């Protein structure tokens, strides 16, 4: 909550971890105090963007067509094309596949009917309906965003778990990230952080380290 307590969370936490054949991630945790999560409005799904990214990065895709699909393969990234569409809604073996393979879909917003109609069955229980952006936008200002964002979802829980960063980074970097998620639930509630009743974190097969 206050930053030394912080990196010293952080710091036990990788000390506590027994080092296993893969690079561990640090997830962190914080469980909320009188807040009714029975009122929809006090839920929270949030995107936050890490001011250091995840570890590795967001792999997205973009359906499309044009130049928004050009800008898409200039800029490295999966291109599904608008004749793809109907073609991935009938194959779902692949469909499936792909939506595991990505963590965000962005799309022309004139299709967003079509992908609905055709992969809104297998993209919106997972999470993974695209976002839609003009045919004609500038779409490398959200794709560098967005290869830095995690979602914060509590759903009606009283608590959440989310990525910070991944035990190649620094202490001083998973500690930025812990306090770009703290500032969401700061502006969430109107006693902000006074909700946050227990905070943690901890590697990927590291035990939790409770913060203070």
């Given at each position: 909550?206050?930053?030394?307590?912080?990196?010293?969370?952080?710091?036990?936490?990788?000390?506590?971890?027994?080092?296993?054949?893969?690079?561990?991630?640090?997830?962190?945790?914080?469980?909320?105090?009188?807040?009714?999560?029975?009122?929809?409005?006090?839920?929270?799904?949030?995107?936050?963007?890490?001011p250091?990214?995840?570890?590795?990065?967001?792999?997205?895709?973009?359906?499309?067509?044009?130049?928004?699909?050009?800008?898409?393969?200039?800029?490295?990234?999966?291109?599904?094309?608008?004749?793809?569409?109907?073609?991935?809604?009938?194959?779902?073996?692949?469909?499936?596949?792909?939506?595991?393979?990505?963590?965000?879909?962005?799309?022309?917003?004139?299709?967003?009917?079509?992908?609905?109609?055709?992969?809104?069955?297998?993209?919106?229980?997972?999470?993974?309906?695209?976002?839609?952006?003009?045919?004609?936008?500038?779409?490398?200002?959200?794709?560098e965003?967005?290869k830095?964002?995690?979602?914060?979802?509590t759903?009606?829980k009283?608590?959440?778990?989310?990525l910070?960063?991944?035990?190649?980074?620094?202490?001083?970097?998973?500690?930025?990230?812990?306090?770009?998620?703290?500032?969401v639930?700061?502006?969430?509630?109107?006693?902000?952080?006074?909700?946050?009743?227990?905070?943690?974190?901890?590697?990927?097969?590291?035990?939790?380290?409770?913060v203070?």
């Amino acid at each position: 909550m206050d930053r030394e307590a912080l990196l010293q969370a952080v710091k036990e936490a990788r000390e506590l971890a027994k080092p296993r054949n893969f690079t561990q991630s640090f997830e962190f945790i914080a469980t909320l105090k009188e807040i009714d999560m029975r009122k929809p409005e006090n839920r929270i799904k949030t995107e936050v963007v890490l001011p250091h990214g995840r570890g590795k990065e967001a792999k997205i895709a973009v359906i499309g067509t044009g130049d928004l699909a050009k800008q898409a393969e200039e800029l490295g990234l999966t291109v599904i094309r608008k004749e793809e569409i109907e073609e991935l809604g009938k194959n779902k073996r692949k469909l499936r596949k792909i939506a595991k393979a990505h963590d965000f879909f962005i799309a022309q917003a004139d299709l967003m009917p079509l992908i609905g109609r055709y992969m809104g069955v297998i993209l919106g229980p997972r999470g993974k309906m695209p976002k839609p952006v003009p045919a004609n936008a500038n779409i490398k200002p959200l794709v560098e965003r967005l290869k830095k964002t995690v979602v914060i979802n509590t759903r009606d829980k009283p608590y959440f778990q989310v990525l910070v960063g991944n035990e190649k980074m620094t202490d001083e970097q998973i500690v930025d990230n812990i306090e770009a998620v703290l500032n969401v639930v700061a502006k969430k509630y109107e006693k902000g952080l006074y909700h946050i009743k227990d905070a943690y974190v901890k590697l990927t097969m590291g035990p939790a380290v409770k913060v203070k």
